[PDB]
Amino acid sequence: FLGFLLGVGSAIASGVAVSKVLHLEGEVNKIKSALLSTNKAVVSLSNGVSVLTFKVLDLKNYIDKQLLPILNKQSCSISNIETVIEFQQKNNRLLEITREFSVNAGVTTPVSTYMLTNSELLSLINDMPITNDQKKLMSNNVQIVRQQSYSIMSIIKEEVLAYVVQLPLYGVIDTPCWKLHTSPLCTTNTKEGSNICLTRTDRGWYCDNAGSVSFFPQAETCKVQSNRVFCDTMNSLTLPSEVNLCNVDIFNPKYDCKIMTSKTDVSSSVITSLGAIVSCYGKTKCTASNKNRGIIKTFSNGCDYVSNKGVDTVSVGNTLYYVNKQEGKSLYVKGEPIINFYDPLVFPSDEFDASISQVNEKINQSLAFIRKSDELL
Amino acid sequence: FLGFLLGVGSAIASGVAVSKVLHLEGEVNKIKSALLSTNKAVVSLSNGVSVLTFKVLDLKNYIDKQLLPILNKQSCSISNIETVIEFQQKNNRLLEITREFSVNAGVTTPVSTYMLTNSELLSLINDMPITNDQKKLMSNNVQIVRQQSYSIMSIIKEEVLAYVVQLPLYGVIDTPCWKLHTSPLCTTNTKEGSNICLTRTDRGWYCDNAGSVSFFPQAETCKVQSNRVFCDTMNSLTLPSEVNLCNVDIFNPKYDCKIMTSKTDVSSSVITSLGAIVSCYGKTKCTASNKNRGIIKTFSNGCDYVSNKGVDTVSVGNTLYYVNKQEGKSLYVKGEPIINFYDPLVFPSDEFDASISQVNEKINQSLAFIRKSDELL
Amino acid sequence: FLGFLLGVGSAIASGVAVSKVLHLEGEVNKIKSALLSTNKAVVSLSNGVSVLTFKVLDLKNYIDKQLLPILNKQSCSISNIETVIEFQQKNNRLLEITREFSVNAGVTTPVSTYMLTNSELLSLINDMPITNDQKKLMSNNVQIVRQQSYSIMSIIKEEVLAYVVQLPLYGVIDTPCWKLHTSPLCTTNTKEGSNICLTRTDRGWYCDNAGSVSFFPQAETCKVQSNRVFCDTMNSLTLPSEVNLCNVDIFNPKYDCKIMTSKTDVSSSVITSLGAIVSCYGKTKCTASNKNRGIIKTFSNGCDYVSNKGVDTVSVGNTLYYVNKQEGKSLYVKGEPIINFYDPLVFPSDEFDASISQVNEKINQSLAFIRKSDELL
Amino acid sequence: QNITEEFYQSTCSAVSKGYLSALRTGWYTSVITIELSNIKENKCNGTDAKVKLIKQELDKYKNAVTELQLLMQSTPAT
Amino acid sequence: QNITEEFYQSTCSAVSKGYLSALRTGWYTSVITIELSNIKENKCNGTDAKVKLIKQELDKYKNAVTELQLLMQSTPAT
Amino acid sequence: QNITEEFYQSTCSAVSKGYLSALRTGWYTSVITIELSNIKENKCNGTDAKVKLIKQELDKYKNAVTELQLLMQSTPAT
């Protein structure tokens, strides 16, 4: 819910900064000349920064071993094979690359195999000034890295085409992350509309990071890959370690847990890594099955849960959800629905960005200037 | 507005479950062997479930009718045509398929013609254990079905490439759906900022379904196709039939209609299936034209409406909207703007997730502990 | 934040209207015949409107200069080269086009070079009945125009394939736009949870337009291109010129500036065109560096700012942001944090869609029926 | 392009100025067309080489024409 | 298809009727497969023409097979 | 990978544990380059076969080079 608390960056500012620089008159030449006839340079610029350069395709020094080697037996005749083959394809790359920039007005992502071949990528990764676990990680997950990379068209000039490539740095690795799922919790009692709900708004991915915790509110800005979690910090908050306390004890004095109130008791499910939360309310039909032998459990109104051991699938209302078949150990932790601790008479049924204790203050306010302005009379 | 009430699923859990299974040592072979030299199997697994299998491309038993049939007259010579042709293309497919998985890190949608050819698709649809109207529907809308399908890379192994394909089931068909559009309704009176608005938050698609109604809050998770509506229940709520009552009578005792209050009177339009709602407020220029002979109507402040008979286009402020030229019968239903029933003095001008009667309780609260704590004094 | 105030249109209603028309029996022929053997027609329809028509590819009158010119020396023999070449490619286009419509169920965007070649595009732009600055603009930004264009599959019929192409009109050009960035402003005082925030909700792009101002709340529905801003009015509001007053004077009597309150003091950054806003709160580490010589500034709690002169990069918490290297003149305007003017004791800490003066009324309400119902006692 | 920006410490906000509009206000439709022959299966056996190849660039062609027919008679999904 | 709509002036709202459902309620999985040879580097020098070309459509082929191997052993990103 | 999860009945919530980070903290830029000849229209009439074909893979090539020129002198749209 809390994605509106995020800051706002400029994903390709890094990359463009370098593009911008490639229009300085001296620069373009400094580059070509530095790849005199090497293929990986390290040209420091006339801005004054180091950029691993890279000629990946020589077409000038190919065409010019068959412009003059064919502007003579032609016009006209034939030459042979091999030369067609090894150009049809050589040129073809460029054509793709040109398609790609033209449709995405000069900026592509993911970065394609044409823009950078595994060949060329892994090599880049190898001489990147960065740790060794970074290297291995990147190498075993190239199609992800490609997804988090950008490619930025920069210049076509005399006899040279430059485009910048922006690649991720994984400055944080092998720290423990964890994922928090939350459905709404309401009172079950019978009169339709007599009922109060509350939800934890703090759902997301959470990863330990430099003594704090990076929190990712919109959990589809992260890709799990087995048990690795690729996130981007551009979409994160930096919170105290204490924020975990909300899971064992949502009332704790150390961190003030975040919630949302409403009166809107509606049935829904949340599928977890290894199970399924069910919020059943009203006249809803909520169920959990095994594909083979059908319904194996029927939920009562309120918020409950099942693991994916034995369960394939869960229906709530007319909504069937397949469960995640990942393997692991679930543990149910019985506890009193905290919503049962609140007097409906003085409960804030409209609160989108609130905390546990904000609700409390707001209650005391109500409670006090009820009871006082009352025995008064 | 109400999309935040939705649950949260795992769209490809079904599919992946099967992928996972294809790494059991016995399984991969059980498959190849079961397609001994048939092309559509039904291998039950060493998990123990039935999956229509499908070899769609034999390259081993092609290459091995020109490895040995060409590792002999070469090295070196030539063979002929036909063999190049019917491989250049045969291989080409695979290359596409490989592109597709590499860019989308192993998961594609829509499912492409390379991943599955109409040829192969329709055949699949034919032997799918499902009703006959399903079959016809799917067949007449393949490019939609492709859109709602997923394709999941699973394994490359010894001499075999397996990827799972997840295809929709349309378990609900030919029931009546209907679409609800809502713009904000405010008071028109003159002092800028003296004014109160209210909007129905319950907009979306609505379809009758097993005695209840599936409700789709974000109506771009549905595609109309003529007069068929393809939705996905994964993004729906299951509500009482009574919820329709809100259209004839928003005050009705049976279902408690949902709204949102604010003081934010701003001009806007909503284009309907067959017309256009206009919310005109303040100094805004709101109009409806015929392309040919220009402006044919000028709106007064407040919320009004026009059908697409005669009208091509509607401008509100500096925003031109083309109207939907679909053919049908509109009917205007004159009624008193309910916002005219509310005393501005005790109206909740900030409420994002509220109902008609929630507003009422909140009013009585205000009304009472005004009048009581007042004659008091 | 305010994107929920937008209206809702039907982006391709214009285009489809014309598609619809191409199924009138008389129409399809009226078209083919009107391109008797011209390539750009202007067929007025049997609905009765003018549409620049365009045959871009003749395959009938190509195949029929090698059906009969090859159903005779074959069966069977060979013909030559050139004819293969200039068809392999001619046909190839169509194949792309067919891919494109099949995956996007008949509606593509951006509009591809296959759907329309620069060749054909610019020609279209040339004979478009529109001003000359429009023409030049469109011509120097074709890959943007392609991005804002749509292409709508319409009919395959006897010997003819018609698809409609919807192209932007830039009816507003060279007026001054400007971009507003806003981070949250809170009180800094020490007890965690004793603290109140407020944010301007009115962020977006703003462009002068016909005496009013078009406002674009979700500023990623706009693409800057150097110092040109391409927006689409479909996602805009039409507001009074006065709305600018909120920047010099947020208290001004003429326009009532929009804000949001909360108690949720969290650290974040907003990267501007030429700098970076920092909202530092709590125990957060917020900093600004120069890549070369490291940290050059450390922020105090509260809301501050730095220009991109000298600064490359800004970290807030565990979130590094590269700054925009665009060149320009920043100016810091020192001012008292307005949040310092509010008594925490009677401040509305939950308000998502509010104004400066709405807060004031709500305060007076609190202030009054405190002080009155108090000396009372 | 004289681009320029001001930060307001009062209200934690900033304005970037010096930009020029280009707003999509309207639309230009226009039909684009392609003519097609339909032909029989009438063909050949053979062949030397450069018509075994021209036949293949023609499987694809009807293949296409088939898919485009599948997109039959309906409102397109916007 | 008799499509029809009513505007409610009372509540600034409208309902379009006359539509027919097609809802995705469930899923149909099914494995799709492709068989592959693996071969050595054993090849040739030569050649006349139409095997200098068949060798190229085979660089690409293993190239592919290589990328598909890179997608090694993990949960796919949904 | 020992993945594990706990449901809290108290607060209708659940935590999945046993995951390992990989966070994008920074960026690695690097210029990628391609060298190009420019050539005249100087060509030929002819021809036997395998240069009527090499000329076509060269229309496309300048065609490309033309589009890339169209992407002239501006900030790219992020």
Swiss-Prot record, chains D, E, F:
Q: Which residues are glycosylated?
A: 2, 45
The domain of life is Viruses
Which compartments does it reside in?
Virion membrane; Host cell membrane
Q: Which residues form a coiled coil?
A: 51-71
This chain's function reads: Major determinant of the species specificity of RSV infection. The trimer of F1-F2 (F protein) also facilitates the attachment to host cell by binding to host heparan sulfate. F protein is involved in the entry into the host cell through the interaction with host IGF1R. This interaction activates PRKCZ/PKCzeta that recruits host NCL/nucleolin to the apical cell surface where it can bind fusion glycoprotein F1.
* Subunit architecture: Homotrimer. Heterodimer with fusion protein F1; disulfide-linked. As a heterodimer with F1, interacts with host heparan sulfate. As a heterodimer with F1, interacts with host IGF1R; this interaction activates PRKCZ/PKCzeta that recruits NCL/nucleolin from the host nucleus to the plasma membrane. Part of a complex composed of F1, F2 and G glycoproteins. As a heterodimer with F1, interacts with host RHOA; this interaction facilitates virus-induced syncytium formation.
Could you tell me what this protein is called? Fusion glycoprotein F2
Q: What organism does the record attribute this protein to?
A: Human respiratory syncytial virus A (strain A2)
Which residues of the entire protein appear here: the answer is 26 to 103 of 574
